[PDB]
C-alpha cells in the first residue's frame, strides 16, 4: 500500500522562499542552550558537542511551522501520529547513543553503576544500573509521548470549546432581544475570556514543549560529555 | 611582634556540649542579661526567661535547644525558681540560647519596665504621629514609624501590667 | 468520534496497491540483472552485500519449526481476533 | 454456557476516573505557586528568575494532566 | 452468545467522578492564598506582585478544574 | 441482542460523588484561615488587607464548591 | 465523606491558632474570632453535604 | 470513612498544641482550653457521620 | 479504612511531640501526658469504626 | 452450573483506575519545584546545581507515570 | 487500605525523630523510646485492621 | 441453587487498582528530592552524601513500585 499525500506547508514554503531569498540575522532561538554547553572558561571537549545545533534548529523550525500555525482553524498537523513521532525521536536519540557507543570507551559507562563501594554490589548497585539503563529508553519514550499527548489534548479541547461557542452563539443570540439578555451577555463574555485564555495557553505550551523536546536530547548528550581543563 | 587578641583577657568563655554526650536534667537556666558592654545579670540561675524575637515570643527554660534570636523592641521577663518576676524592656539586640543551659541576652539598651513612664510615652506617640504627617520624604516617614513602633510597644507593655 | 476525525491528513491524492510477491520478484530480477555480469566476481563485497543477507534470512525462514500458527500476512480480513483464517 | 456481553455505558465510568488524576495536578500546580510567593518574599531580587522556574514546573505538572485527559477523550469517544 | 447491553444511568456515575477532580483544584487554590498571606506578612511591601502571581496560579488551577468540568457536563448530556 | 436498561437508583450515586468534592473545598477554607492567623501574628499591622485577601481566597474556593454542588443537585432531581 | 475534609479543615484552623496564640498571646481575641469565622465557613459546606445525605436518605 | 478526616484532624490540633506549648509553656492552661474547643467541634462533625452510620445500619 | 486516618493522626501527634521535646526537654512530662490524651481521643474514634465493623461482620 | 461470562466494556474501568496514579506523580513534581523555588531564594549562587537535581527527580518521577500510562494502553487497546 | 494510613504515620514519626535528634542531639534516647511507643500504638491499629481482613478472608 | 460464574473481564479492574499504588511512590520520590534541594542549599558542602542518600530512598520506593507492577502484570495476564 502506497499513499501519496502532501504536507500542509506549501504556502509557508512559498513565504520562506519569498522572505529568505536575502540574508537576515537571527537573535531569538527557542532552545538557546544547544549553543552554550560550557559555562566555565578554560573547559573544552574533544567530542563534537556542537553537532546537534543544526538538527536542533531545523527541528524547531519544522515543529514551529506545524504546531504554532495549527491554532488557525482547519490547519492540519500532518505528522500527528504516535509512531511517527516515535520514529523521529528514535532516529535522534539512538543516533546520538550509537555515536557514544561506537567510541568504544567502556569506562564512559562506569557512572551507570550507581552508588559507592559501600553499597552491596549485587543487591543494590546492579539493580540501580538496570533501572538507569531502562530509564534511558523510558526518557526517549516519555519525550515522544509528551510531545504527542500535549498537542492531541490541546486540540481536542479547542475543538470542543469552539463547537460549544458556535452552538450558543448561533442558537441563543436572540436572547439579546429578550428579557434574559443579561444571562446571554454574561455567558458570551465568559466564552470570549475562555477563548483568549485557551489561545494564549496553547501558544505558550507549543514553544515550551519544543524547548523540552530539544532539552531531553541535549541532556542525553551532556550525560556522557567529559570536559578537560586548559593548562 | 605579635599582639594579644582582645578576647584573651576574658576568662568567662562559652561552654558548648559535645553532641555525642549524655543528657543532663537541669532545673536552672544561667542567664546573662547585658547592656552596652555591661551585665545587668551575670550567670544568674533562673527558672525561665521570656523574650520577643522577630518571629514571635519564646519561653526559654533549662535545656532549650541551641538557637539565635533577633530581638525586637519589647519587654523581657525573667522568672526565678523562688517565684519572683523581674521585667525589663529592650530596644533590640540578640539572644543566644545554648543547649548546655545558658542564655546570653545582649541588648543595646535594657531598662526595667518601672523606669519607663506611660504619660511620657503616650504624649510622644502623639507628637511622632504629627511628625509622620509632616515627614518630608519616604525615608523620614520610615524613621518616624520606627519610633512609633517602639513607643506603642512601650505603651502596650505598661498597659498590660 | 467526530472530534477525533479532525486529526487526519487533509491532502490525500492517490493510493496504490501491490502484492509483496510481485515487487519482491521484480526486485530480485533487477538484482540478478545487475549482479549477473562477469565483471562483478562472486567474491566481490558488492555481490556478497547483495546476496548473503537475503540468503541468510530466507534460510532462517525455511528452518523455522514453530509449534504455533502464524496467520497469513496478506489475508482479506485480519481484524477478527477469533478467526486467524 | 458461553455468554458474551458488551456493556456500552462503561466508557463513562472510566472517563470519570481519569478526571480524578487532575485533582493531583491541580493541587500540584497550586503547591508550586505557594512556594513561589513564599520564596519571592524571602528573596525578591530573583522574582523574575523564580517566576520562570515556576512556569516550567507548571507545564511539566500540567503535561501529566493532559495524559489522563487524553484517555478520557479516547474512552468518551469510543 | 452475543449479547449487547446499553445501561442508561451510568452517565450519572461518570459525571460524579469528574466532580471529584475539583477537590484538588479547590484545595490547591486555598493553598495558594494561604501561602500568599505568609509572604505578605513576611514582606508587606510586595502586596501587588504577589497578588498578581496568586491570580495567575488561580487561573491555571481554575483551568484544570474547567477541563474536568467540561467532561462532567458533557457526560451528563450524553 | 439489543437490550436497553434504565436503572432509577443511579442518579443517587452520582449525586454522592459530587458531594465528595466539597471536602477538597472545605479543607481549602481551613488552610487559608490556618495561615491567616499566622500572618496576623507575624504582621499584626496588616490585619485588614490579609483578611480581605483571605475572603477573596475563600470565595474563589467556594466558587469551585458551588460548581460541583450544581451537578450534585441536577442529578438528584433528574 | 465530604465531612472528612470539613473536620480536617477545622483541625488545621485550631492547629495554627495555637501556634499563632503562642507566638503572639496579646492577639488571642482577634485570632480566636477569625478561627470562629473560618469554622463557620467550613461548617456551611458541611451542612451542604449533610443536606444532600439526608435528602438521599429519606427519598 | 468520614471519621478518618475527623480523627486525623484531632491529631493535627494536638500536634500543634505540643509545639505551641513547647514554644511558650506558660500559656499551656490557656492553649489547652482552645485545644479542647477544637476537639469539641470536630468530634461534633463525627457524630453526624456516626448518626448516618446508625440510621442506615438499623433501617 | 477509617483506621487509616486514626493511625496517621496518632503518628502526627508523636511527630510533633519529638520536635517539642527536643526544643524544650524540661517539659517532656507535661507534653507526654497531652500526647497520650490525644491518642486516647483518636483511638476512641477507632473504637466506633471497629464497632461498626463488628456490628456488620457479625450480621 | 458452569457459566462463563465476558463483559466487554470493563477495560475502560481499569484504564481509568491506572490513570488515577498520575495524580501522585503530578503532586510529587509540584512538590519538587515548590522546594526548588523556596531553596533557590536561600542559596541563589547554587541555583543552577539545584535545577539539575530537580530535573533528575522529574526524570525519575515521570517514569513511574509511564508504567501506569503503559498499562492503560495495554488494557485500552485490548 | 487502612495500612496505608499506618505506614505513612510511622514514616511521619521517624521523619520527625530525625529532625528532633538534629535539633537536640543529646536527647536521642528519650525520643527513640517515644518513637517506639508511637510505632507500637499505630502498629496495634494495623493489627486490628489485619484481624478484620483475616476474619473476612476466612469467612 | 448452586451457580458458578467466571467473569473474564475482572482482571482489568484489579490491574488498575494495583497501578494506583504508584501515586504514593511518585509522591514519595517527589518528597525525597524536595527535601534534597532544601538540604543542599542549607549545607551545600555535603551535596554528594545527600545525593547518595536520596538515591537510596528512591531505590527503595522504586522497589515497592516494582512489586505493585508485578501484581498488576500477573493479574493482567493470568
Ligand atoms: C499512475 C498515476 C501517476 C502516479 C505514478 C506513481 C508511481 C509510484 C511508484 C511506486 C512508489 C512507491 C512509494 C511511494 C511512497 C509515497 C510516499 C509519500 O507520498 O510521502 C509523502 C511525501 C510528502 O512530502 P512533502 O512534505 O509533501 O513534500 C514533497 C513535495 O514534493 C514538495 O517538496 P519540495 O518542495 O521540498 O521538493 C523540491 C521542490 C522545490 O520547489 C519547487 O521546485 C517548486 C515546485 C514544486 C513541485 C512539486 C510539488 C507538487 C505539487 C502537486 C502537483 C502539482 C501540479 C501537478 C499537475 C498534474 C496534472 C495532472 O522541487 C521539486 O519538487 C522538483 C520538481 C520540479 C518540477 C518542475 C517541472 C517544470 C516543467 C516545466 C515544463 C515546461 C514545458 C514548456 C513547453 C512549451 C512548448 C511550446 O512525499 C514525498 O516526500 C515524495 C514521495 C515521492 C515518492 C516517489 C514516487 C515515484 C515517482 C512518481 C513520479 C510520477 C511522474 C509522472 C506523473 C504524470 C502525471 C500523472
Ligand atoms: C509570537 C506570538 C504571535 C501571536 C499572534 C496573535 C495574533 C492575534 C490575532 C487576532 C485575531 C485575528 C482574527 C483573524 C480572522 C481571520 C478571518 C476569519 O474568519 O478567521 C476565523 C478563524 C477562526 O475563527 P472561528 O473559530 O470563529 O471560525 C468560525 C467559523 N465556523 C463557524 C465556520 C466554524 O480565526 C482564527 O482561526 C484566528 C486564530 C488566530 C490564533 C493565532 C495564530 C498565531 C500563529 C500563526 C501566525 C502566522 C504568522 C505568519 C507570518 C509569516 C511567517 C513567515
From Swiss-Prot, chain A:
The chain crosses the membrane at residues 25-45, 46-66, 84-104, 118-138, 144-164, 178-201, 208-230. It is a multi-pass membrane protein. Its main location: mitochondrion. It is found in: Mitochondrion inner membrane. Keywords: ATP synthesis, CF(0), Hydrogen ion transport, Ion transport, Membrane, Mitochondrion, Mitochondrion inner membrane, Transmembrane, Transmembrane helix, Transport. The keyword Nucleus does not apply. One of its GO terms (cellular component) is mitochondrial inner membrane. GO terms for biological process: ATP biosynthetic process; proton transmembrane transport. Mitochondrial membrane ATP synthase (F(1)F(0) ATP synthase or Complex V) produces ATP from ADP in the presence of a proton gradient across the membrane which is generated by electron transport complexes of the respiratory chain. F-type ATPases consist of two structural domains, F(1) - containing the extramembraneous catalytic core and F(0) - containing the membrane proton channel, linked together by a central stalk and a peripheral stalk. During catalysis, ATP synthesis in the catalytic domain of F(1) is coupled via a rotary mechanism of the central stalk subunits to proton translocation. F-type ATPases have 2 components, CF(1) - the catalytic core - and CF(0) - the membrane proton channel. CF(1) has five subunits: alpha(3), beta(3), gamma(1), delta(1), epsilon(1). CF(0) has three main subunits: a, b and c. Belongs to the ATPase A chain family. This is ATP synthase subunit a.
Amino acid at each position: 500500500m502506497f499513499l501519496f499525500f502532501f504536507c500542509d506547508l506549501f504556502w509557508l514554503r512559498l513565504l520562506l522562499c519569498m522572505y529568505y531569498c536575502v540574508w537576515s540575522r537571527l537573535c531569538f532561538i527557542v532552545y538557546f542552550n544547544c549553543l552554550m554547553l560550557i559555562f566555565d572558561f578554560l573547559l573544552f571537549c574533544l567530542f563534537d558537542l556542537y553537532l546537534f545545533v543544526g538538527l536542533c534548529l531545523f527541528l524547531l523550525l519544522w515543529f514551529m511551522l506545524f504546531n504554532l500555525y495549527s491554532l488557525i482553524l482547519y490547519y492540519c498537523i500532518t505528522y500527528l501520529n504516535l509512531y511517527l513521532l516515535f520514529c523521529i525521536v528514535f532516529l535522534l536519540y539512538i543516533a546520538f547513543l550509537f555515536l557514544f557507543c561506537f567510541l568504544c570507551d567502556f569506562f564512559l559507562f562506569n557512572n551507570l553503576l550507581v552508588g559507592d563501594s559501600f553499597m552491596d554490589v549485587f543487591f543494590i548497585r546492579f539493580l540501580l544500573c538496570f533501572l538507569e539503563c531502562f530509564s534511558l529508553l523510558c526518557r526517549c519514550l516519555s519525550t515522544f509521548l509528551r510531545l504527542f499527548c500535549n498537542l492531541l489534548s490541546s486540540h481536542f479541547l479547542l475543538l470542543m470549546f469552539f463547537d460549544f461557542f458556535y452552538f450558543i452563539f448561533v442558537f441563543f443570540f436572540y436572547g439579546v432581544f429578550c428579557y434574559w439578555f443579561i444571562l446571554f451577555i454574561f455567558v458570551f463574555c465568559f466564552c470570549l475570556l475562555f477563548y483568549v485564555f485557551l489561545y494564549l495557553l496553547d501558544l505558550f505550551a507549543a514553544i515550551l514543549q519544543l524547548f523540552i523536546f530539544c532539552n531531553m536530547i541535549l541532556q542525553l548528550i551532556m550525560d556522557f560529555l567529559l570536559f578537560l581543563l586548559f593548562v | 611582634h605579635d599582639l594579644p587578641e582582645g578576647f584573651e583577657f576574658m576568662e568567662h568563655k562559652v561552654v558548648n556540649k559535645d553532641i555525642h554526650a549524655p543528657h543532663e536534667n537541669l532545673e536552672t537556666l544561667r542567664l546573662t542579661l547585658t547592656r552596652q558592654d555591661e551585665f545587668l545579670l551575670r550567670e544568674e540561675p533562673v527558672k525561665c526567661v521570656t523574650v520577643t524575637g522577630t518571629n514571635g515570643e519564646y519561653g526559654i527554660y533549662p535545656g532549650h535547644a541551641y538557637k539565635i534570636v533577633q530581638l525586637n523592641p519589647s519587654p523581657l521577663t525573667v522568672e526565678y525558681t523562688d517565684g519572683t518576676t523581674k521585667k525589663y524592656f529592650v530596644s533590640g539586640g540578640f539572644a543566644h540560647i545554648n543547649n548546655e543551659g545558658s542564655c546570653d541576652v545582649n541588648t543595646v539598651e535594657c531598662t526595667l519596665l518601672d523606669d519607663l513612664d506611660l504619660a511620657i510615652a503616650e504624649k510622644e506617640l502623639a507628637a511622632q504621629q504629627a511628625a509622620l504627617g509632616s515627614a518630608k520624604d519616604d525615608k523620614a516617614k520610615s524613621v518616624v514609624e520606627i519610633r512609633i513602633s517602639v513607643i506603642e510597644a512601650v505603651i502596650a507593655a505598661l498597659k498590660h501590667h | 468520534s467526530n472530534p477525533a476525525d479532525h486529526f487526519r491528513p487533509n491532502l490525500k491524492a492517490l493510493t496504490l496497491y501491490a502484492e509483496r510477491q510481485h515487487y519482491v520478484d521484480r526486485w530480485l530480477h533487477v538484482k540478478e540483472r545487475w549482479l549477473a555480469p562477469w565483471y562483478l566476481p562472486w567474491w566481490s563485497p558488492l555481490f556478497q552485500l547483495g546476496t548473503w543477507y537475503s540468503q541468510r534470512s530466507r534460510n532462517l525462514f525455511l528452518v523455522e519449526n514453530h509449534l504455533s500458527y502464524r496467520p497469513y500476512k496478506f489475508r482479506r480480513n485480519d481484524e477478527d481476533r477469533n478467526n486467524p483464517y | 454456557s458461553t455468554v458474551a456481553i458488551s456493556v456500552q455505558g462503561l466508557h463513562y465510568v472510566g472517563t470519570g476516573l481519569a478526571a480524578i488524576a487532575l485533582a493531583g495536578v491541580g493541587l500540584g500546580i497550586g503547591t508550586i505557586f505557594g512556594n513561589l510567593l513564599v520564596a519571592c518574599a524571602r528573596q525578591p531580587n530573583l522574582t523574575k528568575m523564580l517566576f520562570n522556574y515556576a512556569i516550567l514546573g507548571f507545564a511539566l505538572t500540567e503535561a501529566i494532566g493532559l495524559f489522563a485527559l487524553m484517555l478520557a477523550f479516547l474512552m468518551l469517544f469510543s
